[PDB]
Design a protein around this motif. Structure first.
Motif, PDB file in Angstrom:
ATOM      1  N   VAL A  77       0.788  -1.233   0.000  1.00 18.54           N
ATOM      2  CA  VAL A  77       0.000   0.000   0.000  1.00 18.54           C
ATOM      3  C   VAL A  77       0.825   1.290   0.000  1.00 18.54           C
ATOM      4  O   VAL A  77       1.491   1.631   0.990  1.00 18.54           O
ATOM      5  CB  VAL A  77      -0.959   0.038   1.186  1.00 18.54           C
ATOM      6  CG1 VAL A  77      -1.588   1.417   1.292  1.00 18.54           C
ATOM      7  CG2 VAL A  77      -2.035  -1.021   1.000  1.00 18.54           C
ATOM      8  N   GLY A  78       0.752   2.005  -1.125  1.00 17.57           N
ATOM      9  CA  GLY A  78       1.482   3.251  -1.289  1.00 17.57           C
ATOM     10  C   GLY A  78       1.140   4.013  -2.564  1.00 17.57           C
ATOM     11  O   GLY A  78       0.056   3.843  -3.126  1.00 17.57           O
ATOM     12  N   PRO A  79       2.068   4.857  -3.052  1.00 19.92           N
ATOM     13  CA  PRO A  79       1.942   5.689  -4.258  1.00 19.92           C
ATOM     14  C   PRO A  79       2.264   4.994  -5.577  1.00 19.92           C
ATOM     15  O   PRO A  79       3.425   4.707  -5.882  1.00 19.92           O
ATOM     16  CB  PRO A  79       2.912   6.825  -3.984  1.00 19.92           C
ATOM     17  CG  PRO A  79       4.060   6.078  -3.359  1.00 19.92           C
ATOM     18  CD  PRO A  79       3.364   5.107  -2.391  1.00 19.92           C
ATOM     19  N   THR A  80       1.217   4.751  -6.355  1.00 24.02           N
ATOM     20  CA  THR A  80       1.337   4.117  -7.652  1.00 24.02           C
ATOM     21  C   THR A  80       0.474   4.913  -8.636  1.00 24.02           C
ATOM     22  O   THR A  80      -0.580   5.445  -8.262  1.00 24.02           O
ATOM     23  CB  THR A  80       0.855   2.635  -7.590  1.00 24.02           C
ATOM     24  OG1 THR A  80       0.934   2.045  -8.896  1.00 24.02           O
ATOM     25  CG2 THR A  80      -0.579   2.549  -7.071  1.00 24.02           C
ATOM     26  N   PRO A  81       0.928   5.045  -9.899  1.00 19.49           N
ATOM     27  CA  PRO A  81       0.125   5.795 -10.875  1.00 19.49           C
ATOM     28  C   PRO A  81      -1.214   5.113 -11.209  1.00 19.49           C
ATOM     29  O   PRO A  81      -2.093   5.723 -11.824  1.00 19.49           O
ATOM     30  CB  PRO A  81       1.063   5.914 -12.086  1.00 19.49           C
ATOM     31  CG  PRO A  81       1.992   4.758 -11.940  1.00 19.49           C
ATOM     32  CD  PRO A  81       2.255   4.721 -10.455  1.00 19.49           C
ATOM     33  N   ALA A  82      -1.369   3.860 -10.779  1.00 22.33           N
ATOM     34  CA  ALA A  82      -2.597   3.091 -11.023  1.00 22.33           C
ATOM     35  C   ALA A  82      -2.601   1.804 -10.199  1.00 22.33           C
ATOM     36  O   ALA A  82      -1.603   1.071 -10.186  1.00 22.33           O
ATOM     37  CB  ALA A  82      -2.710   2.749 -12.509  1.00 22.33           C
ATOM     38  N   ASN A  83      -3.708   1.524  -9.510  1.00 21.38           N
ATOM     39  CA  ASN A  83      -3.796   0.302  -8.705  1.00 21.38           C
ATOM     40  C   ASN A  83      -3.456  -0.865  -9.627  1.00 21.38           C
ATOM     41  O   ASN A  83      -3.848  -0.861 -10.795  1.00 21.38           O
ATOM     42  CB  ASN A  83      -5.206   0.129  -8.142  1.00 21.38           C
ATOM     43  CG  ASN A  83      -5.599   1.253  -7.195  1.00 21.38           C
ATOM     44  OD1 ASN A  83      -4.887   2.250  -7.066  1.00 21.38           O
ATOM     45  ND2 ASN A  83      -6.749   1.102  -6.537  1.00 21.38           N
ATOM     46  N   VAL A  84      -2.712  -1.847  -9.128  1.00 29.30           N
ATOM     47  CA  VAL A  84      -2.341  -2.978  -9.968  1.00 29.30           C
ATOM     48  C   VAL A  84      -2.387  -4.301  -9.240  1.00 29.30           C
ATOM     49  O   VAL A  84      -1.925  -4.431  -8.109  1.00 29.30           O
ATOM     50  CB  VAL A  84      -0.914  -2.828 -10.558  1.00 29.30           C
ATOM     51  CG1 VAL A  84      -0.844  -1.631 -11.486  1.00 29.30           C
ATOM     52  CG2 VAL A  84       0.094  -2.684  -9.436  1.00 29.30           C
ATOM     53  N   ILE A  85      -2.944  -5.290  -9.923  1.00 29.98           N
ATOM     54  CA  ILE A  85      -3.052  -6.635  -9.399  1.00 29.98           C
ATOM     55  C   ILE A  85      -1.919  -7.404 -10.064  1.00 29.98           C
ATOM     56  O   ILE A  85      -1.923  -7.601 -11.280  1.00 29.98           O
ATOM     57  CB  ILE A  85      -4.395  -7.278  -9.798  1.00 29.98           C
ATOM     58  CG1 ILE A  85      -5.560  -6.331  -9.477  1.00 29.98           C
ATOM     59  CG2 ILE A  85      -4.555  -8.609  -9.089  1.00 29.98           C
ATOM     60  CD1 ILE A  85      -5.723  -6.007  -7.997  1.00 29.98           C
ATOM     61  N   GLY A  86      -0.944  -7.816  -9.264  1.00 26.93           N
ATOM     62  CA  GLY A  86       0.186  -8.547  -9.796  1.00 26.93           C
ATOM     63  C   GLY A  86      -0.121 -10.012  -9.990  1.00 26.93           C
ATOM     64  O   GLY A  86      -1.286 -10.419  -9.980  1.00 26.93           O
ATOM     65  N   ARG A  87       0.927 -10.812 -10.168  1.00 25.14           N
ATOM     66  CA  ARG A  87       0.759 -12.248 -10.357  1.00 25.14           C
ATOM     67  C   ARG A  87       0.481 -12.924  -9.029  1.00 25.14           C
ATOM     68  O   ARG A  87      -0.266 -13.902  -8.964  1.00 25.14           O
ATOM     69  CB  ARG A  87       2.010 -12.850 -10.991  1.00 25.14           C
ATOM     70  CG  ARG A  87       2.240 -12.374 -12.400  1.00 25.14           C
ATOM     71  CD  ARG A  87       3.454 -13.025 -13.050  1.00 25.14           C
ATOM     72  NE  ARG A  87       4.734 -12.575 -12.504  1.00 25.14           N
ATOM     73  CZ  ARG A  87       5.360 -13.137 -11.472  1.00 25.14           C
ATOM     74  NH1 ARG A  87       4.828 -14.187 -10.854  1.00 25.14           N
ATOM     75  NH2 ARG A  87       6.526 -12.646 -11.065  1.00 25.14           N
ATOM     76  N   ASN A  88       1.079 -12.385  -7.972  1.00 23.45           N
ATOM     77  CA  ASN A  88       0.914 -12.940  -6.635  1.00 23.45           C
ATOM     78  C   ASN A  88      -0.564 -13.163  -6.339  1.00 23.45           C
ATOM     79  O   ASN A  88      -0.937 -14.156  -5.702  1.00 23.45           O
ATOM     80  CB  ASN A  88       1.491 -11.996  -5.574  1.00 23.45           C
ATOM     81  CG  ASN A  88       0.597 -10.781  -5.326  1.00 23.45           C
ATOM     82  OD1 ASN A  88       0.501  -9.885  -6.166  1.00 23.45           O
ATOM     83  ND2 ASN A  88      -0.075 -10.757  -4.172  1.00 23.45           N
ATOM     84  N   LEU A  89      -1.402 -12.235  -6.794  1.00 26.11           N
ATOM     85  CA  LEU A  89      -2.831 -12.329  -6.550  1.00 26.11           C
ATOM     86  C   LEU A  89      -3.547 -13.017  -7.705  1.00 26.11           C
ATOM     87  O   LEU A  89      -4.484 -13.775  -7.490  1.00 26.11           O
ATOM     88  CB  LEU A  89      -3.407 -10.926  -6.280  1.00 26.11           C
ATOM     89  CG  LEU A  89      -3.943 -10.608  -4.865  1.00 26.11           C
ATOM     90  CD1 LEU A  89      -3.021 -11.145  -3.798  1.00 26.11           C
ATOM     91  CD2 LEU A  89      -4.109  -9.102  -4.698  1.00 26.11           C
ATOM     92  N   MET A  90      -3.098 -12.770  -8.931  1.00 24.03           N
ATOM     93  CA  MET A  90      -3.714 -13.415 -10.088  1.00 24.03           C
ATOM     94  C   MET A  90      -3.627 -14.930  -9.951  1.00 24.03           C
ATOM     95  O   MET A  90      -4.523 -15.638 -10.399  1.00 24.03           O
ATOM     96  CB  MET A  90      -3.038 -12.976 -11.390  1.00 24.03           C
ATOM     97  CG  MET A  90      -3.478 -11.601 -11.875  1.00 24.03           C
ATOM     98  SD  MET A  90      -2.533 -10.993 -13.293  1.00 24.03           S
ATOM     99  CE  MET A  90      -3.521 -11.619 -14.636  1.00 24.03           C
ATOM    100  N   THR A  91      -2.550 -15.426  -9.341  1.00 24.91           N
ATOM    101  CA  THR A  91      -2.384 -16.869  -9.143  1.00 24.91           C
ATOM    102  C   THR A  91      -3.334 -17.402  -8.055  1.00 24.91           C
ATOM    103  O   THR A  91      -3.584 -18.607  -7.972  1.00 24.91           O
ATOM    104  CB  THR A  91      -0.939 -17.231  -8.729  1.00 24.91           C
ATOM    105  OG1 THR A  91      -0.650 -16.675  -7.443  1.00 24.91           O
ATOM    106  CG2 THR A  91       0.050 -16.702  -9.736  1.00 24.91           C
ATOM    107  N   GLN A  92      -3.856 -16.496  -7.229  1.00 21.68           N
ATOM    108  CA  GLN A  92      -4.776 -16.861  -6.154  1.00 21.68           C
ATOM    109  C   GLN A  92      -6.225 -16.932  -6.625  1.00 21.68           C
ATOM    110  O   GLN A  92      -7.070 -17.524  -5.960  1.00 21.68           O
ATOM    111  CB  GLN A  92      -4.668 -15.860  -4.999  1.00 21.68           C
ATOM    112  CG  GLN A  92      -3.315 -15.856  -4.322  1.00 21.68           C
ATOM    113  CD  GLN A  92      -2.863 -17.261  -3.946  1.00 21.68           C
ATOM    114  OE1 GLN A  92      -3.543 -17.969  -3.187  1.00 21.68           O
ATOM    115  NE2 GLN A  92      -1.716 -17.678  -4.481  1.00 21.68           N
ATOM    116  N   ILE A  93      -6.513 -16.338  -7.780  1.00 27.27           N
ATOM    117  CA  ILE A  93      -7.876 -16.356  -8.290  1.00 27.27           C
ATOM    118  C   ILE A  93      -8.100 -17.343  -9.430  1.00 27.27           C
ATOM    119  O   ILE A  93      -9.243 -17.613  -9.810  1.00 27.27           O
ATOM    120  CB  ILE A  93      -8.311 -14.960  -8.755  1.00 27.27           C
ATOM    121  CG1 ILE A  93      -7.479 -14.526  -9.967  1.00 27.27           C
ATOM    122  CG2 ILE A  93      -8.183 -13.975  -7.584  1.00 27.27           C
ATOM    123  CD1 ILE A  93      -8.066 -13.336 -10.722  1.00 27.27           C
ATOM    124  N   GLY A  94      -7.014 -17.884  -9.969  1.00 23.77           N
ATOM    125  CA  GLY A  94      -7.137 -18.841 -11.053  1.00 23.77           C
ATOM    126  C   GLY A  94      -6.694 -18.313 -12.406  1.00 23.77           C
ATOM    127  O   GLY A  94      -6.529 -19.089 -13.348  1.00 23.77           O
TER     128      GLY A  94
END
Ligand SMILES: Nc1cccc(CN2C(=O)N(Cc3cccc(N)c3)[C@H](Cc3ccccc3)[C@H](O)[C@@H](O)[C@H]2Cc2ccccc2)c1
Lengths: 99, 99
Positions: A77-94
């Motif tokens: 959680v911090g300063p990013t030009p756009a919220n992003v879902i990485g692989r760490n989470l993409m691998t958790q959803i299928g």
């Protein structure tokens, strides 16, 4: 649900009780969200690396829901030009790369 | 095929007649590749833009091989932290996100 890539893969996720947009960025190891206030503890971590490092707050098992896909995972959680879902989470959803 | 995401989507392309390492980046709008003596005409197109811009050469309709899939597409050439295969080049190859 299959998502073609003729456009930027921006889906909606439900975090910390709030609703936000997020790009399903596969060239991303981690998930970074625009300043929020998740409860629980966290640890300070550095990311980026090109141009210096950007420091953020690391959280664990922070429940998160993706396109109705209730899941759990680390959310920097911090300063990013756009919220992003990485692989760490993409691998958790299928989510997979298919062609 | 079906590329899971526990690892980084790095696949072996085959541009300019050589063989390379490229990361399938969904969050990536375009495809930029570190130097490849590419024939034909190109033109100046600035990409990125944080901490300043960065100039790379835009060669349109460039032939490329991606995991046994032959296609044609715009590929920007220049200094890029890694060889990335953006959405432009993922659509042409019929690659999708699934979950
Ligand atoms: N045409 C094109 C070329 C290269 C890349 C992209 C697309 N992007 C990037 O690859 N990123 C920079 C980028 C590009 C190449 C390498 C790195 N390390 C970063 C990070 C993704 C990211 C990667 C790794 C860790 C954290 C975040 C950013 O978070 C993403 O939102 C977009 C947003 C964006 C950035 C710059 C210009 C346009 C759009 C498009």
């Amino acid at each position: 649900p299959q998502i073609t890539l003729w456009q930027r893969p921006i889906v909606t996720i439900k975090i910390g009780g709030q609703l936000k947009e997020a790009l399903l960025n596969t060239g991303a190891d981690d998930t970074v969200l625009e300043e929020v206030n998740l409860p629980g503890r966290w640890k300070p971590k550095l990311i980026g690396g090109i141009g210096g490092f950007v420091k953020v707050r690391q959280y664990d098992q922070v429940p998160i829901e993706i396109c109705g896909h209730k899941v759990i995972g680390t959310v920097l959680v911090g300063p990013t030009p756009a919220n992003v879902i990485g692989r760490n989470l993409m691998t958790q959803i299928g989510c997979t790369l298919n062609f």
